[PDB]
Amino acid sequence: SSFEWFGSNESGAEFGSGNIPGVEGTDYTFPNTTAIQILIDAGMNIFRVPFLMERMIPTEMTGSLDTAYFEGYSEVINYITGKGAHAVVDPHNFGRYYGTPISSTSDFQTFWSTLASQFKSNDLVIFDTNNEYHDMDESVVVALNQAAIDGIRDAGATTQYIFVEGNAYSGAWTWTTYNTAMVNLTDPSDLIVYEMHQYLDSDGSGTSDQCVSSTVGQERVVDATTWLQSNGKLGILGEFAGGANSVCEEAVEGMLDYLAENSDVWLGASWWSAGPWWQDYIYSMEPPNGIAYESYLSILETYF
Numbered sequence: 001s002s003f004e005w006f007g008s009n010e011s012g013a014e015f016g017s018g019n020i021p022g023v024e025g026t027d028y029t030f031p032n033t034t035a036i037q038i039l040i041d042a043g044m045n046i047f048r049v050p051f052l053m054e055r056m057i058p059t060e061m062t063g064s065l066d067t068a069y070f071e072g073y074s075e076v077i078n079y080i081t082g083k084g085a086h087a088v089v090d091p092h093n094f095g096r097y098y099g100t101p102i103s104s105t106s107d108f109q110t111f112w113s114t115l116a117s118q119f120k121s122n123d124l125v126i127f128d129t130n131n132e133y134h135d136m137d138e139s140v141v142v143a144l145n146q147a148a149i150d151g152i153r154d155a156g157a158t159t160q161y162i163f164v165e166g167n168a169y170s171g172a173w174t175w176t177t178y179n180t181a182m183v184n185l186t187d188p189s190d191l192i193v194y195e196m197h198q199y200l201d202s203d204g205s206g207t208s209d210q211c212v213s214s215t216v217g218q219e220r221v222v223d224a225t226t227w228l229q230s231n232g233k234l235g236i237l238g239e240f241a242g243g244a245n246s247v248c249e250e251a252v253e254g255m256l257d258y259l260a261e262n263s264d265v266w267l268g269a270s271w272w273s274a275g276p277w278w279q280d281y282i283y284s285m286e287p288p289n290g291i292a293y294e295s296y297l298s299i300l301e302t303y304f
């Protein structure tokens with residue numbers, strides 16, 4: 001009841017990015033609908049599913065779908081929506097295609113029309129333009145988000161929310177520093193949500209189980225919250241995590257507390273990450289015994 005959406009990322013289909021196309025069961029896998037079902041049972045209602053653009057539409061952004069990869073991916077998506085939860089389709093590509101930064105709004109628009117055409121009637125799907133643009137020109141990033149919106153709506157997918165992401169890994173703490181221009185995005189359906197990510201280790205990389213302090217999360221979302229409220233925009237924390245210790249748990253709690261106090265603009269949050277190949281990853285939300293499952297799931301359920 002704190003937020004409209006609260007759930008988790010479901011990783012695996014984006015693994016082994018060095019091997020394109022790669023081999024299912026070896027370089028990558030698709031998420032496990034049984035574990036997902038466990039998390040739905042815990043009360044989560046949104047699941048973000050990363051995938052690789054190059055595996056979904058090989059060779060050129062304007063090309064055809066890879067039927068095998070698309071069918072494995074859409075099985076998970078349609079499992080999530082068939083249970084009533086929102087499913088975020090996430091090209092997990094950092095603004096790049098075969099390593100080169102994306103610089104064609106028309107090719108990107110075509111990619112998004114091809115992809116969104118396959119989910120056009122599913123009002124539980126959420127489209128994510130791209131995961132964590134970075135080290136690119138801001139005008140190109142804004143232009144690519146606009147082109148993604150254009151392709152999604154032109155394909156007849158007009159009822160779905162679209163999660164836009166900014167430059168600088170779409171970090172919340174740096175949002176007003178690099179991504180103010182993102183205010184100028186439009187959508188014929190008026191369903192734009194600004195997705196930001198926030199980790200609590202010193203550099204915000206989310207690669208350590210140690211946080212800066214028990215208060216760093218809230219501190220790192222203040223300015224983004226003010227920006228959302230000032231410009232009449234909506235936001236979602238598409239990625240966040242903390243280590244299995246008291247300081248990190250208090251910092252996550254304080255951050256989520258601040259967001260819930262500002263739920264007029266903050267539509268929810270999604271933990272990074274669940275999925276079947278994480279093993280003892282420091283942030284694993286995957287049942288039955290991921291580190292974050294055991295240390296954090298009960299904490300997150302308090303916001304459900």
Ligand SMILES: *[C@@H]1O[C@H](CO)[C@@H](O[C@@H]2O[C@H](CO)[C@@H](O)[C@H](O)[C@H]2NC(C)=O)[C@H](O)[C@H]1NC(C)=O
Binds near residue numbers: 032034
């Ligand atoms: C997908 O997730 C399910 C649920 O966690 C896995 O099933 C468990 O598998 C273990 C194997 O030792 C069984 O002992 C448990 O009883 C199962 N739990 C439940 C609740 O079903 C399943 O193995 C996973 N599949 C893949 C491909 O990883």
Ligand SMILES: OC[C@H]1O[C@@H](O[C@H]2[C@H](O)[C@@H](O)[C@H](O)O[C@@H]2CO)[C@H](O)[C@@H](O)[C@@H]1O
Binds near residue numbers: 015
């Ligand atoms: O952990 C092994 C696994 O890592 C995958 O990359 C991870 C990365 O380790 C993590 O720091 C980041 O948050 O997520 C990415 C995947 O989204 C890698 O793709 C796999 O090949 C590897 O097995």
Ligand SMILES: OC[C@H]1O[C@@H](O[C@H]2[C@H](O)[C@@H](O)[C@H](O)O[C@@H]2CO)[C@H](O)[C@@H](O)[C@@H]1O
Binds near residue numbers: 132205
């Ligand atoms: O936000 C997760 C993201 O972190 C990336 O590291 C960034 C960091 O986010 C940013 O605050 C800092 O200024 O730059 C570093 C890069 O050196 C990381 O590269 C990603 O894998 C990760 O998804």
